[PDB]
Structures are given as structure tokens and as C-alpha cells.
Design a protein around this ligand. Structure first.
Ligand SMILES: CCCCCCCCCCCCC/C=C/[C@H](O)[C@H](N)CO
Ligand SMILES: CCCCCCCCCCCCC/C=C/[C@H](O)[C@H](N)CO
Lengths: 242, 249, 293, 49, 92, 293, 242, 49, 49, 48
């Protein structure tokens, strides 16, 4: 009998405890692993994949649920009009929940790193124009005009020539990691607001549709990192599984 | 093109005549890893049978160690404070009885769903760190890392978390650094029906690998509210005892 | 040496430092772990420009923009099964010119109110071609795929399609709408053959999974202002070296309009989407009588 | 008897879209068709937050 | 695009570990995959025995966690927390 | 090698001998640990006499006794954020001559019955100067400070001031006096701007912490018989490399009379205390539109 | 099954026990520690900082609580008058409770080493005079006159020229460490009494105030060391925290 | 369940069962059940002598 | 979980058992031992007087 | 407060009886003509 003292924590079951348990099957060798393509070895690999961002999360009925994946762009009065706004927080409850970056961010408390938001123009080849996609760092509210918005981190997107630009949301925060921003005290961890403005217009000739659509694809860069794995709250079930 | 881009024979020497003293006096007990690695009561959770506090057999205790004066004054000697914590939960009846009841401690980090009931689906703890332990078992001890998004925990946050105008309705947000609120510590009685024992879960927390930075004045007033330096203004007491006169003791 | 090498990570390229007090490696702790395939890499990104310079598979040639806008699924070219992965002891047949060739399925019409369609593989090629005969005649099947979805529209037309390859695309139902029926999709829905099946709820892909997050899977865009075709070279993915081609679909090809098709009146209203797929490195084993299903 | 399961030495291969609908039946991707909810929260307008 | 082609950047030493986003970190956390009822008067398992078919898709949290992928090879640490439906620890 | 290096003391200069039976270093024991910065060191004591020989910061010069009676906060000179400490990927702007200069705030009058005032930093410099414009325009802010509190009085005047820098000076309330109200201080009390705020209860510093123990923080004395000024060079302290300058005050400058001001009748009764502060190594990141708060 | 005997002390929870506990978060790496100035690595560093000593702990009301931090000095009759006395015990309930040395001493049972008590003169530049600050070693009661006091360890302080002197209270005790002296049996551990006497006077011309103040700052030397950490009793709360 | 607590000189002696001195944030204290074996602790040489 | 069998004698308190117990005071160094004359190191020294 | 935003010095005249305020050469032009009340106020040095 080796002398031994039991500390606090015996006979407890920590669900995330990494321990050695008794094997049920002695000398059981598993089925050999054949090579399966596409193996994932880190969730940040999934976070780096561009995934459709639901900027136009206005419709709710199932008939128009497909309209959430794209937001309209059309000819305007040429006064620097606002096209679309959304918060740049991947873990926030909103546009980013449709993204794999948003869904995987739901399973982690803290995130850090820059974000790729690719805006792809899905109008005609004869549809020309420019958009100012402005990312406002935290502190600046929703810009009233394009002049307010261009003071932040912004890109100018010729969608007449280049059908898809990426707006890199740079990692600009006080903290090294960001918790998930919420409507309250945790808005301290806001990434900011990303707003798309008509830099010139949406110009088409006769025969081309007057309204086009932009598909926002959201992702994260190589410097992205999630921390402190937690239960997700993007989707919740009040009923059991039959 | 710009070029601008141990006493020996104020160290006791300048005041008195001194002898040589071999000071074999260790300073190892005044370190942070000695002064702070002592478990103190930071949380008490009541799970009564008829009371209105937590009558459904579950409780969501927001992690806030400023609820008890001893450890709060200990850690509030500094502002910035980075450590790993040894969290111990001593569950017992309010009469002190050790009853054969099984509990589920669950760490619920911010963003994870706080359980709305005893039989909530958040108790499946597929990603949340959770402890299953009986009261007949010794108190559940878990090692909690330094989980803050900041480089240190911050018992005093001179500022506001959000932007915008800060009215009197948003004045409660002052001093609430979300680098310190780390979700809730959720306790349940594991079962569909109500537990037959009134239960008290006492949280004892010991900080290891402690690093603390900025020493402030201690707390010489009575604590009133958690994460709040508020003091009783009409009953401000001195830092120590008083004297009838200064020429006497 | 004192423990069986029988954990689930044996044979992998990563050394796992672990703790084990038992005879079996699977009893040990999780431990430590001592362009991107998931981002739909192109042929230029995969370093496979030599195999894509002109896409001629079998007696079939597709003329399309190569290399840059041509996607290799999961960064993996299709290949024949190795000796280590294969378990079937009989040597499989590799026709490679009669079955490895572009088959043109159908010409589904894209409308302004169109929802989208899915094709299950190799169920699409089950009952046509020498590939179909080999799939019906052999129990075991293994092949990659070169799906070339084609949708031509004029420069005054607009719209984009998400041409994506969804592996193990299990079809769910509405469950009676109220969710309390436990209904199952019919055989013509699960394995719709060459003519495919229209999506009833493209937002959830008729499976409860969002269409928005489909781009982790090997995907392509047929944004009409930029490209009129989508070439996805798809490897064989399964938990098994081989599988039945008649009762298991390795992947489902989703072709849905994320951006609706729109054009002014006067332009041609018939915008068809043509599905072309070439099996790659096809392998058929376990020969018996031919079975349709 | 509550079964809690922790997977070690994990290898996973093919990432799919997550589950944005409520689960109804085990080993079944069935969803409530008449109550399909969006992947996330909604907005009253797209020019506002 | 690595922050360089969009903005002007400073040098940042990213000592940010990716070890917590691995499968052995995201999935090595025990979750409720099965609950077995052995009541006294109920009709579920009244004879004191139960046969629970191994199917971890019965609870939404772990089912959605593992269903992020199709193919998934792992060894499992199975823990069975037996208790009374009132949570009591009975000598059984 | 078999454990993660993930305790709270990793990267520190002290080796901790410990006991660990687990995969994580933070699970281990507390273990063993295998002039003075807190005593308000002077510039002579810090070895920084070369940077203090004549205090000219920007286009501003203060004339004061140097080196011996000039305090560097916590023995640390202000410095730009290193690559290891910084997390924001955008390169910050460093104006360094338009924002790093002495700003003169106000001229608060010292009375015989005066209680004391506090100034919150950089809230004092939020809405004035190029520093104010940069703080309003940029989300992220990082700077040290060179606070030069000035109080001139004649040789027949007496009194001493505790000029101290209190980091994270959180303001508390009287809680209704009885301590049962849970009141919170208003915005004009927490962030009083350049004109500061008078202490209601200087004994507890309106925070429940004694004024007597304030000298652990970087402090100075304006004992009028000896010195008429207090120069405290203050570094940037935060748990973060950068922070918002509009809703977080890194420190609060306490200027309270420990010894009351007294003089005979005939001497000038207006004894003003002038606050001068120079930001040092200012760093602004996260540029957007200007916001007052 | 390795043979093992459980000793006394199993399943006990010693609050000060240093043990190894199960980590809740596997493979969680914390936020990297940025450099924060002023780091404390030992409480004796805090004990070595001069902190205002409340020698004049006579006033009690909140209006005159600021008068506790300083004690008056004024012109006398030139008879070696007594200015102020206080006990030299940092852990004793009294003048030293306002000191960080006193507060940190409240958390430790035993202390040893010498103490620095800096007396700073806060009168006018024209205020001259000398004070005899005498530290009486234990055994000697409160001195009746300055002649009784000068027999102990004392310093003579010209506050006309040097505005701040430090009286080093040397470590003179029978025991190697001192417990906290109390009014009773534990007065065995008294440090003694520190008394300030008018060595000559407080001399001012016309136009200078007739009463000045001395601010006592108390600290500990490099040889100081605290031992046997214990719960503090300097402040006690009879009410819970809401 | 009992709470042994070492209260060194100067530390507050608890005046009641529910005293705030039982938070033992610095005092060495033992939590142990009677069903557990007797609580054994190693006490050093603590005398100032 | 290292496999382990508890023998007879667990949770017993032998009063003369020489074992290792949990220290109440972490990193507590005692008062240094000054030289005191006449130290006894064996009771047979007392028996020889 | 308006004045301290420019080039300034702070002068303790209690201790140092004479300070010098250096008016630095800050102009658009390399040389300054003599400023006058009119068009030639372009060449102003500023205000002290
Ligand atoms: C399985 C149980 C795990 C328990 C996890 C507990 C997390 C430990 C975090 C402690 C860090 C400080 C928490 C809050 C600090 C303060 O109380 C206030 N927020 C600041 O006044
Ligand atoms: C002594 C107890 C031993 C317990 C053995 C449990 C076997 C573990 C097998 C887990 C592998 C997945 C089981 C079934 C998967 C899914 O629930 C569905 N079949 C697929 O939707």
C-alpha cells in the first residue's frame, strides 16, 4: 500500500478532462484508415473558406429566404447613396450567422485576426459602376453619408471590370482577442460597421436589367484564431429529438 | 536626405551604529504565489426546496469574485492581475449535511447558452467544461486557466465598455470590463424531478501562477456591491483606530 | 512496444504525445499534436496545370477556360485505389476510355423564379454508357468525377449559380411541415438519375443545412458576366476504397441560383443549364449479373 | 443513466454546412418544412442595423 | 488578402496559438449523447433493463458538433452518470 | 515537451519549478520561484538623466528642476508598442510633435479649505489639440504622459500637495450615504475632461481607497517650501497594447492638499494649481470618422 | 491495480494546499502577456514604499478625516514640549493602519526588520526649527520629557534646512520575528514608542503662519520580511456584498 | 461536512457559524466530511522563536 | 486513470504512521534555528545522566 | 487652451528669473518679407 492522499477533485467528472480510461475491447485493432480527400485538421482551415454572408437578412418567409444570400444594387440618383450596412463581428447574432466563420465563431468565446469579406457582382457584363465599401473601426457610428464613411478603412470597387472584390476587415482592436459583441456591455468587443456606398452609380445601357445583386462572401484570414471553446447559441432547440 | 526620420558593520547605517546581522530571512512567503495561492470563498450558490432564490434546482452564478470581502480586498490590492485559478466547489446541505445527491457544475463561457431550467438542453455540455460529482465525493477541484482576452484580469476599469453617450441609465456600465466577466458557473441537480435535498454550493478559489502589476491603496471602506468601489458616504470610517489625544497612546 | 498501436490516429502523419496506463493506444488521452484544400483550390493552385491544359477525357473534349477558374475538389486529383486502401482482393477493371469520358446529362432550364437542382453521383450515370453498364454489372465502384456545368447567357443577362459538390448529400423532408411525421424522401428524390431533381427548399438544401455555408465543399460560380461554365474536378471520397454505385451516392452536385436570372424583354428567355461529367480513374470490382438498382 | 461521450484521437474529413434547422429525428436530416427559420437574426431594413 | 494589399500595416508578432481549434480540442469535450430511463411505474423500461441503441444524434449540441463533417474517425471516452430522476445518489 | 506551455506565467523571466500530472501547464501547482519601480523612482534613480536634462517635448518647454526631483512612473519610460505586445495589424500613426507636447489644462485655485481634484487621462486631452483630434478619429490609442503639475507660492506660504497618478481610478459614490442605493457616478464625474473634478471625499478618494496609501502609485509632493512643481513621467499601462481614448481612462491624476494651504493676511490669496501634461510616444490606430465619445 | 494505502487526509480540502487539478479547458493557450509597467513580484516591494502615516489619528468625522494625514507643529514655550507619539508596531491597530506597511502586515502574522518613518515638514520656507524624533526600544514607557526620550534611538531634525528627515526604527527585538503587538499578552512583541519632541522650537517671522504641519510617511527597509500569511483584521465587514 | 480553519494570531476569529472569516481567502482551511478519513495536515515550525 | 487496487488499511489513521501530509502553509520558511546550548538528540543521553 | 496648441514654453519666474521663448522659423516661404496690415500679412510670423 503506497501512501497516498486524495486531493479535492476525486470522483468528479470534468467533461473536458483529458484522461486515461479503461479500454472496453482488449487488443482491438481498428479498421485501417484509407485515404479520404479533404481532411480537416484545424477549424481555422474552415474559417478561412469564403462563405456567403447574409447582408440582406431582411426577408423571413421561406418563399423569399433565398433573397437573403444577395443584396440589390441598382441605378441611383448619384448622391453617394447607401447600399447596405452590416456589423463586422463574426460571432454577433446577425448577418454573419449564415457564415461558417460565424457558425464556428459561435463555438468559441474569443476571436482575433482580420476578416475577408468578398463582394461579388452578379449583374450583367454591361453593368458598370463603382462602390465604396467602408469598414468603420469601433467608435464610429453608422455613417450618415459616404464622406463620413470614407474616413475609415475602405476599398473602392469597380464592379464593371472586376466582378468580385474582397474587403479585408483588418484586425483593429484594443484587446488582443475579441469576445463576441452583443447589444449591451459586450459591444465593447465590436469589430465595427461595414457599409457599402455607391461610389459613382450602377450604369447599364438599354437591354440590361436596372437592378442587379451583390453576393457577399465572408471569411477570415491566415492571422485568424479562435479561443476558449464554448457551447454555441446561434441555433437553439426547445424540443427533443424524436 | 532628411536625417530626421543583511545588516553589516536608510539601511540602518546612516542613523545608528550597527552590528553585523546574518539575515537568513526568506522572502518566499511574500510572493504573489504565496500570498494569493490560498483558496478563499468567492461564491455561494443556494438551491433550496421552498425558497424563491433557485427553486427549480438550477442556478446560474455569474463569475464575479468580488462578492466576498476577504478575497476581494486581497485581489484588489492590484488592478491588473493574471493568474490560473484552482476552483473548488464544496457542496453541502444548508445544515452542513452530506446528502447522496448528484450535481452538475458547468462552466458556461460568454456566448454559450445559460440553462433556462434544470432539464435544459444546455446541460448536454458537448463543448462546455462541466463537472459531474456527488456530495459524498470530496469537493470538485478544477484548474481554470487565464481566460481573459486581455493580458490580465482587471478589478478596476476606469471607463466604459461601449461607445456613445453615457446617460444615467447606462451608468451601471461604468467599471464593467468585459475582459473580467467570463460567463456563468451553472449548477444543477442532475435529474428530471426536483431534488429532495436543499443544497448549498460554496465556491473556493485558489489562484496559481499569479502575476499582478499595479498596486493601489487597499480597501479601507466596507464593500457594498460587487465589481463596484462604492462606499457608504454617510458612514465613512477611518483606516484604523482612533485616539483621544495625539500626545498619548 | 508494451502497448497495441490501435488508436484512431495510427498511420497519420502527426505525432501525438499522450498518456496511457493501459495496453491499448485508444485508451490514451487526447494529448497534443506534438493552396488550402478546403478553399476550392484551382488547377493553378493545385499545381495540376499539366493535366488541365486541354480537358480531353476519353473521346470527349470540353472547350473552356482552364487552370485559373477550374477547381480541383479538396485539392485532390482523382486516382486509382492504392494497395493499402483497397480491401477487395479481386483485381478491378479499369476501362478508362469507355467509362472515363464526358457524359452530357440534360439541359435544365434556368428561370427567373428557378430554385435549383441537384444531381446525385454516380446515380446520374447509373443507366447510361459503358460506365452505366459497368456500374450495373459490378458490385464495387470507385471513380473520381470531372463535372463541367455549362450555362451560356448573353452579356445583357445577369445571375450567378452556386455549382457545388456536396459529399454525402442526404435528402431530408419537410416532415409533414409541422415536423411531427418522420417522413422519408422517395427513391426518385434520393437518386433522381440523369434528369436530376429540383430543390423544394434551396435555402436549407432540402437537408436542413444552409445554402450559404455550401462553399466549404468544392464549389464554383457561374456568374454570367464573368464565366459561362463551372469545371469541378472531383476526387473519390468515401470511408471505403470502393462502394456500390446503385445504392450509395458519393456526392450531390448542387446547381442553384444564388443571384436570380434576369434580363430585359427581347433577350432569349430560354437559358439552359447543361450538366457534363467525366468519371476519372474509374474502378469496377465484384463482377456479377447486371442489376439496375 | 446519462451517457456522456468524449471523442479522442479525432480525425474528421469533409466539412459540410452546419445545422441551421431544428433537429427532429435521430440519424435523419429532416427539418420542419412549414417552420423553416433563417440561419440567423433578421433586420427591419438593410440600410440600418 | 493578408492585410497587405488593402491597408498599410505595422509588424505584428502573432503569438496566437491554433491548438484550441483542432479536432482534438474542439471534439474532446464530453457531451450528453444518451439518457436512459429506468423508472418504477413508467412504461418505458419497467422491467429494470434497457437496450439503448448507440446513436449519438439524439441531442442537438453534440449532433451538430459532429455533423459539421461527414466522415469522422475517433476513439471515444464514454462516461455514464447514473442517478435518480430527482438527482439522488442511491445505493444501487 | 509532453505538456502545453499554457500557464499564466509563460513568457516571464522567472523559472517556476512545479508538479503537473496533466497536459496543460496551467493545471500544475503554484510551485516555487526556482531604484525600486514602486517607490516612485527619480530620473537619476532610473538612469534617464539624458532624456530629462531639459524637458522640451514637441514645441513646448517647461522650466523646472530636473533629474533629482523628477519622477518616472513605475521606473518605466513611455515607449512605442512592440510587435509582440501589439495585436492590431494596421500600422498606427505617430505624430510625435503635434500630439506629443505639453498641454496646459486649467488653473484650479488652491484654498485653505480645498479638498482636491482629479483628472482622468487621456479624457483631459480628448477634445483639444491634434492629440484630441487623433483620439477622436482613431479607435485605438496608446501613449505615455509627462504630467507637470505646477503650483507657485511664496516663501511665506505653506502646504503640500500629493500629486499622484492612480491607474484605473474608478470613481465610486456615497451609495446614497446609507450604502443601500447602488448609485453610479455620472459621465461628468467619471470623465470630467480638462477642467477636472473636485473630490467630494478626498480621504477615500471617492473610491473607498485611502489617500494615505496612494504613494505606492507614481506620486510627487508640491511641498511649497521645497518645490513648486511636480513632474511625473507616466508610461502607458493597460492590460491591452492599445485602448479607446474616449471610454477608458488609463489613470487618474490626483492632486489633493494633504497639508492645507495657509498664509498670513496680506499675502496673495489666489494660489492656483496649473496642470500641464505632455503625451509621450503617442500611438493612434483604427482610423474612422471622428467621435466625441 | 497497484497496491496503495490511503493515509489520513484523503478527500480533505486544504485551502492552502498546492496540488494538481484537472484542467477544464484542454489545449487552451491563454492570451499572450503584453508588457505592463510596474509589475509586483513580492509584497516586500510594496512594504518598502513610503506611505502616509496617520500619527494624528484623533479626528473621526468625515469633515476632518483629511486632518488625520498630518499633525500640527507650532511655536511653543521652549520647554522641550511633546509634539506627537505613536507606537512603532506596523501591525498594531492604530496609526500604522493607514500605511501599506500596516495593511500588508495585517495579512502576515510575523514581521521582522527595520522601519523607515519619513517626517516631512510642510511649513513655510521661513519656518525654522529642530525636532528630536526619538524611538524608544521596548520596555521604556512613554517618556515624560525630552531628556527621558533622548536616551533611546533618536534623530535630530532641522526642518528649517532639510524639509524631510527619515527616522529609521532599527530592528531591536529579543525574537527574530515579531508577531503583531496587541493590548495584552502580545504587547511582548511591541516595537516600542516613537515620540517627536521640540528640540528647539518652531520659529517663524511676521507674515508666516504660526502653525505648520508634518506629514509622517512610514515604510520598511530592505531587511524587512513578513511571515505566516493570515487573514487580515484591520478592516472587518458585518454585512454581505450586494 | 465540517470546515477546519487554522486562524493564526491577528486573523479574525469567527464569531458565528456563518461568519465572513470562513471565506478563508488567506487562512489555511480544510474541508472534509466525517465519512472521509481523518483530515491530516502538515503544520510547519511557525514560532517567531 | 492509472489502474490501482486499495489494500487493507486505507482511510485508517495509524497514530505512529510516518507519512507525507498536505502542508497548510505554502512556501512558509520557518524562523532560523539559533544555537541553543545543551541540545538532546537521543533519550539514551538523558538515561546516562 | 487655444494658445497652448501652438509652440509654447512654460516659465517658472519664481525660480528662473529669465526664460527665452524661441520663435522657431516656421513659414511656407524660405524667406519672409515684412508683414503689413494688408496683402503682405501673408508673411506674418504669427502671434506671441
Ligand atoms: C468548472 C468551473 C470553471 C470556473 C471558471 C471560473 C472563471 C475564473 C475567472 C476569474 C477572473 C475574475 C472574474 C471576475 C472578476 C471580478 O469579480 C469583477 N469582474 C471585477 O471587479
Ligand atoms: C461499455 C459501453 C461502450 C459504448 C460503445 C459505444 C460505441 C461508440 C460508437 C459511436 C459512433 C457513432 C454511433 C452512431 C452514429 C450516429 O448516431 C448515426 N448512426 C448517424 O447519423
Amino acid at each position: 500500500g503506497f501512501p497516498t492522499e486524495l486531493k479535492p477533485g476525486t470522483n468528479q467528472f470534468l467533461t473536458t478532462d483529458d484522461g486515461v480510461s479503461a479500454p472496453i475491447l482488449p487488443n482491438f485493432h481498428p479498421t485501417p484508415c484509407i485515404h479520404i480527400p479533404g481532411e480537416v485538421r484545424n477549424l481555422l482551415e474552415l474559417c478561412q473558406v469564403e462563405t456567403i454572408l447574409e447582408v440582406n437578412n431582411v426577408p423571413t418567409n421561406a418563399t423569399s429566404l433565398m433573397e437573403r444570400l444577395r443584396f440589390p444594387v441598382s441605378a441611383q440618383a448619384g448622391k453617394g447613396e447607401l447600399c447596405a450596412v452590416f456589423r463586422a463581428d463574426p460571432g454577433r447574432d446577425g448577418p454573419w450567422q449564415s457564415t461558417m466563420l460565424g457558425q464556428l465563431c459561435g463555438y468559441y468565446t474569443q476571436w482575433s485576426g482580420s476578416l475577408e469579406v468578398t463582394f461579388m457582382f452578379t449583374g450583367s457584363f454591361m453593368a458598370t459602376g463603382k462602390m465604396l465599401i467602408a469598414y468603420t473601426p469601433p467608435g464610429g457610428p453608422l455613417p450618415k453619408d459616404r464622406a463620413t464613411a470614407m474616413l475609415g478603412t475602405h476599398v473602392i470597387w469597380d464592379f464593371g471590370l472586376q466582378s468580385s472584390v474582397t474587403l479585408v476587415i483588418p484586425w483593429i482592436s484594443n484587446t488582443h482577442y475579441r469576445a463576441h459583441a452583443r447589444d449591451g456591455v459586450f459591444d465593447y468587443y465590436t469589430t465595427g460597421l461595414v457599409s457599402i456606398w455607391y461610389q459613382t452609380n450602377y450604369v447599364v445601357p438599354i437591354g440590361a436589367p436596372n437592378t442587379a445583386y451583390i453576393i457577399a462572401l465572408a471569411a477570415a484570414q491566415k492571422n485568424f484564431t479562435m479561443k476558449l471553446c464554448k457551447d454555441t447559441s446561434h441555433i437553439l432547440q426547445t424540443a427533443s429529438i424524436q | 536626405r532628411v536625417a530626421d526620420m543583511n545588516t553589516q558593520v536608510t539601511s540602518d547605517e546612516s542613523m545608528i551604529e550597527t552590528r553585523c546581522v546574518l539575515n537568513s530571512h526568506s522572502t518566499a512567503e511574500t510572493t504573489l504565489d504565496s500570498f494569493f495561492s490560498r483558496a478563499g470563498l468567492v461564491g455561494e450558490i443556494d438551491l433550496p426546496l421552498e425558497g424563491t432564490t433557485n427553486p427549480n434546482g438550477y442556478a446560474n452564478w455569474d463569475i464575479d469574485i468580488t462578492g466576498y470581502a476577504q478575497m476581494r480586498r486581497k485581489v484588489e490590492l492590484f488592478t491588473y492581475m493574471r493568474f490560473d485559478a484552482e476552483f473548488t466547489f464544496v457542496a453541502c446541505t444548508p445544515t452542513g449535511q452530506v446528502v447522496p445527491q448528484l450535481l452538475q457544475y458547468m462552466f458556461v463561457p460568454p456566448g454559450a447558452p445559460k440553462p433556462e431550467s434544470r432539464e435544459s438542453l444546455a446541460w448536454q455540455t458537448a463543448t462546455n467544461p462541466s463537472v459531474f460529482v456527488k456530495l459524498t465525493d470530496p469537493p470538485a477541484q478544477v484548474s481554470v486557466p487565464f481566460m481573459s482576452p486581455a493580458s490580465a484580469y482587471q478589478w478596476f476599469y476606469d471607463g466604459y465598455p461601449t461607445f456613445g453617450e453615457h446617460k444615467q441609465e447606462k451608468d451601471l456600465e461604468y467599471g464593467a470590463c468585459p475582459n473580467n466577466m467570463m460567463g456563468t458557473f451553472s449548477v444543477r441537480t442532475v435529474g428530471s424531478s426536483k431534488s429532495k435535498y436543499a443544497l448549498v454550493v460554496r465556491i473556493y478559489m485558489r489562484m496559481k501562477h499569479v502575476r499582478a502589476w499595479i498596486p493601489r491603496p487597499m480597501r479601507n471602506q466596507n464593500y457594498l456591491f460587487k465589481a463596484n468601489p462604492n462606499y457608504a458616504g454617510d458612514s465613512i470610517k477611518p483606516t484604523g483606530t482612533s485616539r483621544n489625544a495625539i500626545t498619548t497612546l | 512496444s508494451h502497448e497495441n498501436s490501435n488508436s484512431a490516429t495510427e498511420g497519420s502523419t502527426i505525432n501525438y504525445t499522450t498518456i496511457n496506463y493501459y495496453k491499448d493506444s485508444y485508451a490514451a488521452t487526447a494529448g497534443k499534436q506534438s493552396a488550402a484544400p478546403l478553399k476550392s483550390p484551382s488547377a493553378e493552385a493545385c499545381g495540376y496545370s499539366d493535366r488541365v491544359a486541354q480537358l480531353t477525357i476519353g473521346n470527349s473534349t470540353i472547350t473552356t477556360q482552364a487552370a485559373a477558374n477550374i477547381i480541383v475538389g479538396y485539392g485532390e486529383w482523382p486516382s486509382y485505389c492504392s494497395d493499402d486502401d483497397a480491401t477487395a482482393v479481386d483485381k478491378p477493371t479499369r476501362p478508362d476510355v469507355s467509362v472515363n469520358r464526358f457524359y452530357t446529362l440534360d439541359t435544365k432550364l434556368w428561370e427567373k423564379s428557378s430554385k435549383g437542382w441537384y444531381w446525385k453521383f454516380p446515380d446520374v450515370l447509373t443507366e447510361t454508357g459503358v460506365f452505366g453498364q459497368n456500374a450495373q454489372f459490378h458490385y464495387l465502384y470507385r471513380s473520381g468525377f470531372c463535372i463541367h456545368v455549362q450555362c451560356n447567357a448573353s452579356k445583357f443577362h445577369q445571375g450567378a449559380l452556386l455549382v457545388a459538390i456536396l459529399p454525402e448529400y442526404v435528402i431530408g423532408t419537410v416532415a409533414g411541415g409541422t415536423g411531427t411525421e418522420d417522413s422519408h424522401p422517395p427513391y426518385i428524390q434520393t437518386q433522381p438519375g440523369a434528369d436530376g431533381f429540383e430543390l423544394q427548399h434551396p435555402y436549407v438544401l432540402d437537408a436542413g443545412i444552409p445554402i450559404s455555408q455550401l462553399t466549404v465543399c468544392p464549389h464554383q460560380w457561374i456568374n454570367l458576366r464573368t464565366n459561362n461554365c463551372a469545371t469541378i474536378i472531383v476526387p473519390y471520397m468515401n470511408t471505403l476504397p470502393f462502394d456500390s454505385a446503385l445504392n450509395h451516392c458519393n456526392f450531390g452536385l448542387l446547381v442553384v441560383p444564388i443571384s436570380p436570372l434576369d434580363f430585359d424583354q427581347g433577350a432569349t428567355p430560354v437559358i439552359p443549364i447543361t450538366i457534363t461529367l467525366a468519371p476519372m480513374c474509374s474502378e469496377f470490382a465484384g463482377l456479377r449479373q447486371a442489376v439496375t438498382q
